[PDB]
Design a protein around this motif. Sequence first.
Motif, PDB file in Angstrom:
ATOM      1  N   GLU A  71       0.883  -1.079  -0.120  1.00  0.00           N
ATOM      2  CA  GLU A  71       0.170   0.102  -0.034  1.00  0.00           C
ATOM      3  C   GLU A  71       0.990   1.097  -0.015  1.00  0.00           C
ATOM      4  O   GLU A  71       2.013   1.252   0.406  1.00  0.00           O
ATOM      5  CB  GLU A  71      -0.956   0.086   1.347  1.00  0.00           C
ATOM      6  CG  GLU A  71      -1.990  -0.936   1.126  1.00  0.00           C
ATOM      7  CD  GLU A  71      -2.817  -1.218   2.504  1.00  0.00           C
ATOM      8  OE1 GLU A  71      -2.289  -0.546   3.574  1.00  0.00           O
ATOM      9  OE2 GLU A  71      -3.801  -1.888   2.467  1.00  0.00           O
ATOM     10  N   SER A  74       0.016   5.957  -5.492  1.00  0.00           N
ATOM     11  CA  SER A  74      -0.869   6.624  -6.061  1.00  0.00           C
ATOM     12  C   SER A  74      -1.724   5.851  -7.174  1.00  0.00           C
ATOM     13  O   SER A  74      -1.166   5.104  -8.093  1.00  0.00           O
ATOM     14  CB  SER A  74      -0.462   8.025  -6.964  1.00  0.00           C
ATOM     15  OG  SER A  74       0.208   7.983  -8.012  1.00  0.00           O
ATOM     16  N   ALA A  75      -3.061   6.017  -7.459  1.00  0.00           N
ATOM     17  CA  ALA A  75      -3.738   5.562  -8.598  1.00  0.00           C
ATOM     18  C   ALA A  75      -3.060   5.658  -9.976  1.00  0.00           C
ATOM     19  O   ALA A  75      -3.024   5.067 -10.633  1.00  0.00           O
ATOM     20  CB  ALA A  75      -5.201   5.718  -8.414  1.00  0.00           C
ATOM     21  N   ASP A  76      -2.632   7.085  -9.952  1.00  0.00           N
ATOM     22  CA  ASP A  76      -1.784   7.368 -11.268  1.00  0.00           C
ATOM     23  C   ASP A  76      -0.823   6.517 -11.551  1.00  0.00           C
ATOM     24  O   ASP A  76      -0.715   6.149 -12.688  1.00  0.00           O
ATOM     25  CB  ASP A  76      -1.456   8.875 -11.239  1.00  0.00           C
ATOM     26  CG  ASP A  76      -1.589   9.668 -12.597  1.00  0.00           C
ATOM     27  OD1 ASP A  76      -0.586   9.081 -13.266  1.00  0.00           O
ATOM     28  OD2 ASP A  76      -2.225  10.520 -12.554  1.00  0.00           O
ATOM     29  N   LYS A  78       0.062   3.605 -10.207  1.00  0.00           N
ATOM     30  CA  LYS A  78      -0.427   2.153 -10.582  1.00  0.00           C
ATOM     31  C   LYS A  78      -0.923   1.843 -11.977  1.00  0.00           C
ATOM     32  O   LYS A  78      -0.571   1.007 -12.703  1.00  0.00           O
ATOM     33  CB  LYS A  78      -1.418   1.884  -9.426  1.00  0.00           C
ATOM     34  CG  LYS A  78      -1.020   1.410  -8.002  1.00  0.00           C
ATOM     35  CD  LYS A  78      -1.745   1.129  -6.927  1.00  0.00           C
ATOM     36  CE  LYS A  78      -2.514   1.917  -6.545  1.00  0.00           C
ATOM     37  NZ  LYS A  78      -3.514   1.928  -5.385  1.00  0.00           N
ATOM     38  N   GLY A  79      -1.560   2.924 -12.447  1.00  0.00           N
ATOM     39  CA  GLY A  79      -2.257   2.713 -13.836  1.00  0.00           C
ATOM     40  C   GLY A  79      -1.009   3.000 -14.748  1.00  0.00           C
ATOM     41  O   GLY A  79      -1.237   2.002 -15.738  1.00  0.00           O
ATOM     42  N   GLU A 106      -2.927  -5.007  -2.892  1.00  0.00           N
ATOM     43  CA  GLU A 106      -2.073  -4.022  -2.090  1.00  0.00           C
ATOM     44  C   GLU A 106      -2.268  -4.505  -0.613  1.00  0.00           C
ATOM     45  O   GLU A 106      -3.285  -4.848  -0.323  1.00  0.00           O
ATOM     46  CB  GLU A 106      -2.429  -2.794  -2.222  1.00  0.00           C
ATOM     47  CG  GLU A 106      -2.037  -2.001  -3.582  1.00  0.00           C
ATOM     48  CD  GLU A 106      -2.835  -0.722  -3.733  1.00  0.00           C
ATOM     49  OE1 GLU A 106      -4.279  -0.646  -3.858  1.00  0.00           O
ATOM     50  OE2 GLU A 106      -2.298   0.439  -3.479  1.00  0.00           O
TER      51      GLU A 106
ATOM     52  N   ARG B  70     -13.352  -6.516  -8.932  1.00  0.00           N
ATOM     53  CA  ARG B  70     -13.404  -4.871  -8.451  1.00  0.00           C
ATOM     54  C   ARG B  70     -14.215  -4.818  -7.365  1.00  0.00           C
ATOM     55  O   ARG B  70     -15.312  -5.361  -6.737  1.00  0.00           O
ATOM     56  CB  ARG B  70     -13.957  -4.534  -9.740  1.00  0.00           C
ATOM     57  CG  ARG B  70     -13.507  -4.605 -11.167  1.00  0.00           C
ATOM     58  CD  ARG B  70     -14.685  -3.827 -12.065  1.00  0.00           C
ATOM     59  NE  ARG B  70     -15.147  -4.945 -12.511  1.00  0.00           N
ATOM     60  CZ  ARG B  70     -16.312  -4.769 -13.154  1.00  0.00           C
ATOM     61  NH1 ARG B  70     -16.590  -3.532 -13.592  1.00  0.00           N
ATOM     62  NH2 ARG B  70     -17.106  -6.035 -13.658  1.00  0.00           N
ATOM     63  N   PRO B 108      -9.146  -1.841  -6.493  1.00  0.00           N
ATOM     64  CA  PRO B 108      -9.943  -0.709  -7.250  1.00  0.00           C
ATOM     65  C   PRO B 108      -9.902  -1.173  -8.672  1.00  0.00           C
ATOM     66  O   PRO B 108      -8.810  -1.729  -9.445  1.00  0.00           O
ATOM     67  CB  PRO B 108      -9.124   0.421  -6.895  1.00  0.00           C
ATOM     68  CG  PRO B 108      -8.515   0.236  -5.601  1.00  0.00           C
ATOM     69  CD  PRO B 108      -8.285  -1.297  -5.654  1.00  0.00           C
ATOM     70  N   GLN B 110      -9.446   0.885 -10.945  1.00  0.00           N
ATOM     71  CA  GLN B 110      -8.301   1.249 -11.935  1.00  0.00           C
ATOM     72  C   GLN B 110      -7.026   0.674 -11.922  1.00  0.00           C
ATOM     73  O   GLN B 110      -6.119   1.177 -12.514  1.00  0.00           O
ATOM     74  CB  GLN B 110      -8.201   2.870 -11.386  1.00  0.00           C
ATOM     75  CG  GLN B 110      -9.399   3.722 -11.222  1.00  0.00           C
ATOM     76  CD  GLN B 110     -10.262   3.615  -9.872  1.00  0.00           C
ATOM     77  OE1 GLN B 110     -10.881   2.579  -9.696  1.00  0.00           O
ATOM     78  NE2 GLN B 110     -10.213   4.519  -8.966  1.00  0.00           N
ATOM     79  N   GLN B 111      -6.725  -0.369 -11.117  1.00  0.00           N
ATOM     80  CA  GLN B 111      -5.544  -1.017 -11.135  1.00  0.00           C
ATOM     81  C   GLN B 111      -5.761  -2.529 -11.652  1.00  0.00           C
ATOM     82  O   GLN B 111      -5.351  -3.463 -11.026  1.00  0.00           O
ATOM     83  CB  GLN B 111      -4.934  -1.368  -9.972  1.00  0.00           C
ATOM     84  CG  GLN B 111      -5.512  -1.532  -8.522  1.00  0.00           C
ATOM     85  CD  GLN B 111      -4.862  -1.232  -7.221  1.00  0.00           C
ATOM     86  OE1 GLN B 111      -5.135   0.292  -7.155  1.00  0.00           O
ATOM     87  NE2 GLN B 111      -4.787  -2.035  -6.560  1.00  0.00           N
ATOM     88  N   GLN B 121     -15.962   1.054 -13.471  1.00  0.00           N
ATOM     89  CA  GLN B 121     -16.919   0.654 -12.304  1.00  0.00           C
ATOM     90  C   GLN B 121     -18.016  -0.285 -12.669  1.00  0.00           C
ATOM     91  O   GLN B 121     -18.425  -0.344 -13.664  1.00  0.00           O
ATOM     92  CB  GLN B 121     -17.376   1.897 -11.873  1.00  0.00           C
ATOM     93  CG  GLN B 121     -16.319   2.684 -10.978  1.00  0.00           C
ATOM     94  CD  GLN B 121     -15.362   2.228 -10.410  1.00  0.00           C
ATOM     95  OE1 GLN B 121     -15.424   1.301  -9.337  1.00  0.00           O
ATOM     96  NE2 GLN B 121     -14.001   2.651 -10.540  1.00  0.00           N
TER      97      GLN B 121
END
Lengths: 146, 145, 145
Positions: A71, A74-76, A78-79, A106, B70, B108, B110-111, B121
């Motif tokens: 953990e 950021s989501a950014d 990770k994407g 995570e 998800r 999430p 998004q990953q 979603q």
Amino acid sequence: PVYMVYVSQDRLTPSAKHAVAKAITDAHRGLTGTQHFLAQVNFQEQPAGNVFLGGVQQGGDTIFVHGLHREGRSADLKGQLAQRIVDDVSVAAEIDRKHIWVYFGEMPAQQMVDYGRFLPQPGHEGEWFDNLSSDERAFMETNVDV
Amino acid sequence: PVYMVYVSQDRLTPSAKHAVAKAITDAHRGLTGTQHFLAQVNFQEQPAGNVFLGGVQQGGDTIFVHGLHREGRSADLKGQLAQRIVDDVSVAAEIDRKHIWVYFGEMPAQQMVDYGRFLPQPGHEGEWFDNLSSDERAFMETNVD
Amino acid sequence: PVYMVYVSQDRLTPSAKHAVAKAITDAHRGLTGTQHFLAQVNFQEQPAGNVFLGGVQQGGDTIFVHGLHREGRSADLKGQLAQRIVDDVSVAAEIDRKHIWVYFGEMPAQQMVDYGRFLPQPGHEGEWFDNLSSDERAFMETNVD
């Protein structure tokens, strides 16, 4: 990290496997700054025909990467990291991106052990590595490709 | 979804693998609305004797389903889905429910990447699929039983 | 719990698998109070050479333990448990601690099924077990070493 990579048996030659592991390892290092030797890539082979998509038996081309991270990122980022694994594994395995699935899980660094030691928080790998014994640093440092 | 299904080698013949994978797939679509082709069922076989329960070596009947989902669904819905997987895998595999373990993990969206694309979603699968390229749509629609 | 244990094919004899599965199982029951029969140790073997560290192909010595737990325990307890697994697997498998990786994932008990039944919250293992049927308890009680 530990990257579990689920592939069909003999889909990847020894050379292809090395390339795919290096693509993932380099992507992780490049985007997180975590040291090379902390990236584990663990290949899980099963006979072709053991993957089903929508109930349809598949051939040998599916690749699922299950990445196990601490953990704190950021989501950014990770994407960006998932997309770079998709792109660079596609090149390394000579496989269309439509065959590649990538999931990041995570957990708190406090319940996460590499090389028998508890991991630090993301970004503080330098503090952590300086606190390791000489023998541990040496063992670690051999697990880096030329 | 990705459902990792851990079984002893040959406990599920090729056709029984197909029946188990279709039962999981149908349960997931039925309770979540996610298209058939998004359900991956990934069978992981090991020799009998590699499973231990309370320190005791097992034969070849244990099934562990690790579902990777998800985030975003209710506890109620996930309970219904996990029960249906127990019930419908018991029938497809002709195995006692007491041999079936099912854990759901959530991340999430998004990953999470299926078919090289980031997932939307939950209840948004329709517009997401419609906005994929034509070759991507065609490829996933082949993966429908 | 389900402990997925990723090892190289033939690194552990049947004796050593039993010792590793006992070490993890004793560690979990001893620090959590969960009954023996609820600890599954699921050995996933692959040919040596499928593990890479920093891009370098490994021999047969790496062990990765992926423990899948209910939510609700303290970080303190989880740290004690992960450490005891490192220590006791290292003895049981006669493998240096530097080769051992241990990650814990956690999940709400309500999306977690052992023996075809939903798990209770941690610490409630006795009440939950008594509510199960006689045949379920009998099956589970045979899974104690």
